[PDB]
Design a protein around this ligand. Structure first.
Ligand SMILES: Nc1ncnc2c1ncn2[C@@H]1O[C@H](COP(=O)(O)OP(=O)(O)O)[C@@H](O)[C@H]1O
Ligand SMILES: Nc1ncnc2c1ncn2[C@@H]1O[C@H](COP(=O)(O)OP(=O)(O)O)[C@@H](O)[C@H]1O
Lengths: 202, 207
């Protein structure tokens, strides 16, 4: 068993920021969001199924997913959300095992936005690391980064687990609410070490 | 590595109905076959993509000495414990779904046939296919064939048949049907020739 850490956290909480720090220290990163984008890019592994299931309406002229039109439809119709996720999730799952098999570091970190929401991911990981922060900080950061409105972010936040549920399912926690990310490194240093020890013991 | 608007046929049918037999005929005519059972075997063979998860979730008890799945011990346990069924299938099904897409992407033929035993029993497969082809036959013929070709008793086959969709349900979900109930498979080719042609047209009209 390659030692596996699930890194999760709500939208805008800091998963990417924390993940990078662990990568700089030699952890092997498998970002399920990068995979989700590539499998729906031009020539992506998920596109045949998506065209078939949704129609050429949702395939843009470059072959990729029309992320806009879809962005709307799965918000509008949560029968459609489940229909898309039923295509993408198994593929993401699969690409994850495949990247994990090839990973060269002493342990792996799977960056998984909807980790605790899913039964399968908790079982797949040796530990869960939650990057936590207040909901209003999530909102401000995601408005700033992606240009959305409150309502748009609030809508994603509502489709995700509460802070309390996330914190309850954690083995490890990094509260990322400082004005600045410079102090995160101290926390990541210590977790890295503990992770090396965990892995070595298994 | 590519091909826009790949045409896909789901080939299904109950145990012993003739999926393999019909599939082979289509392959001989240049259809690209993706057998989801071969994939299920491969991902649980030695070095298979599913084995880490299976050892982790179930223990080395169910990993045979060559690294593969102890298909026997498991065969029992998922029948014995339908909490275990769901736990194994949750590992294997997504990986099967994924390998299917990957084999379909690389397929060289004018259309692809997915051989999927439990096709209509699943919402996702119907939507994934342009058409469903059911290979149909009477239950007693399924039973005789599976007794002959795997050695089982009536009871054993009847037990699998009970876990699968009824004929009526399968026929209701079909676009195409081949009734495979003759003493012999020689006459199937005539039906496959015609379907092959109709499939070339369907695929062409999608391009
Ligand atoms: N501690 C922090 N102080 C200020 N900005 C931060 C901090 N942590 C993250 N950010 C920024 O806010 C956003 C948080 O997003 P990110 O790290 O991508 O989180 P996630 O990947 O969970 O959505 C990014 O634009 C990032 O640069
Ligand atoms: N029309 C037929 N006449 C005689 N034997 C048949 C006929 N169709 C299939 N068989 C045999 O009966 C069994 C049916 O199996 P197969 O085509 O593998 O169905 P499936 O793949 O659905 O089990 C096989 O042993 C096959 O050789």
């Amino acid at each position: 068993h390659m030692y596996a850490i699930g890194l999760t956290g709500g939208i805008g909480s800091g998963k990417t920021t924390v993940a990078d720090l662990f990568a700089a220290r030699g952890a092997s990163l498998v970002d399920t969001d990068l995979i989700a984008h590539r499998i729906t890019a031009p020539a992506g592994l998920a596109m045949p199924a998506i065209e078939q299931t949704f129609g050429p309406a949702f395939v843009a002229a470059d072959g990729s997913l029309d992320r806009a039109r879809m962005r709307a439809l799965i918000f509008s119709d949560e029968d459609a959300r489940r229909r898309l996720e039923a295509i993408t999730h198994p593929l993401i799952r699969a690409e994850t095992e495949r990247e994990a098999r090839d990973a060269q570091g002493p342990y792996v970190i799977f960056v998984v936005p909807l980790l605790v929401e899913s039964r399968n991911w908790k079982a797949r990981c040796d530990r869960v690391l939650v990057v936590d922060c207040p909901v209003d900080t999530q909102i401000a950061r995601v408005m700033q980064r992606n240009g959305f409105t409150r309502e748009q972010v609030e809508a994603i936040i509502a489709r995700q687990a509460t802070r309390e549920a996330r914190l309850a399912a954690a083995d490890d926690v990094i509260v990322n609410d400082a004005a600045t990310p410079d102090a995160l490194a101290v926390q990541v240093d210590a977790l890295h070490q503990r992770y090396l020890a965990f892995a070595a013991a298994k």
